[PDB]
Amino acid sequence: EEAELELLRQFDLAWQYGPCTGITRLQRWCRAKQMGLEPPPEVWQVLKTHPGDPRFQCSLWHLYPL
Amino acid sequence: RWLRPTPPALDPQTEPLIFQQLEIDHYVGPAQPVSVPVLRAFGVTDEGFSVCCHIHGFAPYFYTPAPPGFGPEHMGDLQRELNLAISRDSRGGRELTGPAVLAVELCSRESMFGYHGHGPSPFLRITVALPRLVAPARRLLEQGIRVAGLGTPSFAPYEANVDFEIRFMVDTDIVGCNWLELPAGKYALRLKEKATQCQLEADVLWSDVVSHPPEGPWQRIAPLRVLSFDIECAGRKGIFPEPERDPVIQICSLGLRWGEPEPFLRLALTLRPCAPILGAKVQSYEKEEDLLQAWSTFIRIMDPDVITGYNIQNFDLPYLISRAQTLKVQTFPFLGRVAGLCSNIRDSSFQSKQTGRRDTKVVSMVGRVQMDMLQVLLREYKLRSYTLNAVSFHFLGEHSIITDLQNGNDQTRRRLAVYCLKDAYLPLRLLERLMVLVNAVEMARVTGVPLSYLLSRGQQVKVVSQLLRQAMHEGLLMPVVKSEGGEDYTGATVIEPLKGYYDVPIATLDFSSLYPSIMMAHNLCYTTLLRPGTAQKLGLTEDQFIRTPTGDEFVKTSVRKGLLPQILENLLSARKRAKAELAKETDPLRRQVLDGRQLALKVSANSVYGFTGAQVGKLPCLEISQSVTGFGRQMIEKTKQLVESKYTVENGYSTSAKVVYGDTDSVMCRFGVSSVAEAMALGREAADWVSGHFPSPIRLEFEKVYFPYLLISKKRYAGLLFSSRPDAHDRMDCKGLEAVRRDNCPLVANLVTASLRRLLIDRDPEGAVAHAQDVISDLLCNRIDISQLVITKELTRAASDYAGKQAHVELAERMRKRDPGSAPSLGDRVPYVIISAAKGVAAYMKSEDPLFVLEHSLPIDTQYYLEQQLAKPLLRIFEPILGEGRAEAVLLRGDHTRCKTVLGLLAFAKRRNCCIGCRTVLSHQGAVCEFCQPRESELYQKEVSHLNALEERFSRLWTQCQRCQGSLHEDVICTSRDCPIFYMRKKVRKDLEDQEQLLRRFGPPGPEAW
DNA sequence: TTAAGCAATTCGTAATCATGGTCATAG
DNA sequence: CTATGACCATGATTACGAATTGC
Ligand SMILES: Cc1cn([C@H]2C[C@H](O)[C@@H](COP(=O)(O)OP(=O)(O)OP(=O)(O)O)O2)c(=O)[nH]c1=O
């Protein structure tokens, strides 16, 4: 923790995985894996050792009335 | 980056200098030629080199009458006035003045105020060494000691104490933004070892210069250099940025030469490594010290003339200065032209009854000129919101996210830089499109004040300047009268209306430039005001003086010519030339900006008259003001008597006309015919007929024909506008009504405009009733956007708003938990909406910020908006066409439509829904009721045509943001509170969320797993 | 050290007065 | 258990202070 919260914030702004501020984080991870762009096997291995926490399993701007 | 061209081959003993000045400056100096105040003048050549000019040998002075004794006509006492008193008790009278070369001079002059005769009198001219010694001398010659050998017994008053640079410019006939010439052999370039940073540095004596009056070929403008910039900072969540914690991360700059239709420089300086942008240079640094140093070096090397931006004074420059002070970078705050001078932040305030009161900071830059476009908008224009988005929509047509666009990758930083460059580009487009700078240069040339005074001062320095420039040509001196305080006088008359609705044409006749032509054609001035005794015992009344309705006597023009007639005549010709230029444009926005130019010149001419009556001012003469408004009242009642008396049934005409209205310059006479051609013909005959009963330039003129007409009260009416006949109609006129004020809701102003449209153009009251019914019904059914509900009010001086409790003051002074560092200040506008509660004693307890009621979802008081905002303007407008059954008709059109309303323990609801047909709560989830079970195909048919229309509204809105943003492949981030698009795109998601779930009460129309 | 001026219509907000309605007492 | 009196509040109307526009 506090290092796992920057890896996800770095996965969320890389443009080669998609334009993602409307959906979940694991849905975008599996969308890129289907098309197989290059999802890395570390943004998966922190979404498995946690429960349904809203500060891991949510996009950066999931507040913010946009 | 790009440098100025190289000054090749100037030789001073053969060649002159011809350059155009921008700024002047005062400077107390050593290195005297073998006075101490020497003058600086900065400017540009006809090619593009930068020229500093040092001017020597000038010292301030004033005048004082020589008292009638044996002293000031005897040279021993003149030089004894120069000589100091060596006594011990004269330490209060010869120290703070001390040994200064005040000197003694004898001259024959006159005082301005009044008319005593054509004969002058001896005055003493007193020079002083320094400009910062005329204040203690004034404190030592009037209330100080003037016992000096009995030469000047106390007291003799001081006359013509004015400003130093203004006295220089009045002396040598140099005006703002003028062409200046140093002749051959008069100036020395290498006499001044370089202390400033310009290219050419001359060193001239103050009698060598030649001033060219701007006219003919001397009416050009040199190629100046204009810069605009913008900055970005990275803040915390909630917390507004603070110059001791939040770094400056990006600076972006645009630069152009004036006269060329595109820029030539486009630079962006960032603080992490970035990605390239086509059309601009990009440099990157790993520390902020390098970024601030790089910007200071660029601003020294490019060396711009003018610096613009948007809110750069109150946000950008002091943030940069404080941030450079915190990080210990010594070389930043030297931004000016003088090589050894650092810059400093200093507060200032301005207040008037015309613009209100505003408090600004200033930052010192010598040589360079500042033009914040926000202050120009706030001074000239009266709008509803003053945000960059709001004025860019009105004229053209468009913090915590940024901190994670900067802590990310380099394409995010490239997106941030493109956003910042668009921000830094918008005020240039506004400056060149609105004709700001051309009008500022013409104002400085017509009035004679510098170019920095049109952003800091009011309308007094300009009329003082023009009066002094006209006073040197006949030899008069101005006095100092100051009084606190006189009384008011009686203003203008308004004629009593015949209120109602008219449907026969009324023609408008008015006088053009009324008060300046009164002051012109009856020879009224300070310098020809006759005191009550000095007519006596001469008895010549006829054609030597006249008498006014307030009571004064004023000398005819066969003896004197006043000074205010000539200043007014110059201003009137300048405005006439501006209108003659405006009569040949075809573009609409260009036509209104030339209308803005001529409006400014008419405001200047009327502020000449308003100077006289200002008892808190510099020279008031309320006798003149009273004579002006007395002549106004007399002439308008003359107009009304004449118009209603001549064209009558016995005088061969058709119908005796009757005046329905008149307001101090205009007359709205109702003629009787219902043919617009015959009304126009008789109205032109009437205007030209009545004008032949006056001196000149007094003239009445036809202006319009209203058909139909609607008169509600004093200063409240409406009508439809005819300019010609085959030019059928132009537009509506809404004088005073609820559509042009800014104290209300957009909903109410829109309803008033649409009602007058349906009522005056189509003449259908039934569509008007149906329209107002639909507006009220959609209000009560909760389908009206919250853009239409926002009220704005101006937060003025804090003590008047201490005196009585208001709504906007209560919202502003109540801070937020998120941000006690961004809140309304004095002078701005506070927006709010009114929510529903049960505290009926106070409408100042129900007000809330629009963004707070957005994010926290508070309900709206529809009864407040129904009975307090809407109802009474409608009862103003709709009554005069009908009786009081019209009040009952709209309150009954409410009554058929008021019966449809839509909206701890409240959370413990749901788990069942009411019948879609007859609203009966019941156990189970099926949509239809057992009694209304048969009629179900019709109840499914009903409401799927509602889902169908919500689907069509989702798609038109959420793809409009993609075209306003620019991109089709990346996310939208725009929470622009002045866009209707925002929060209208938020509610359709919830309407669709609700209407989709109501149709799943019905089963599915098929399987889905096949 | 610097400031353009005043007349207001008009409506809102606050305070005061009036009028009734409800509750408690007393017969 | 009713009837009368007192209190209390609530609502409406009138009078004063304040943003904007007409001059
Ligand atoms: C607008 C305005 C008018 N007035 C006075 C002076 C004017 O002579 C009188 C008439 O008002 P206006 O009709 O507004 O101005 P005007 O008649 O001088 O010029 P024009 O007809 O070309 O539009 O009202 C002022 O004193 N100060 C002002 O700001």
Ligand code: SF4
């Ligand atoms: S909400 Fe959409 S349409 Fe409205 S300003 Fe923002 S981007 Fe433009």
Ligand SMILES: [Zn+2]
């Ligand atoms: Zn039913």
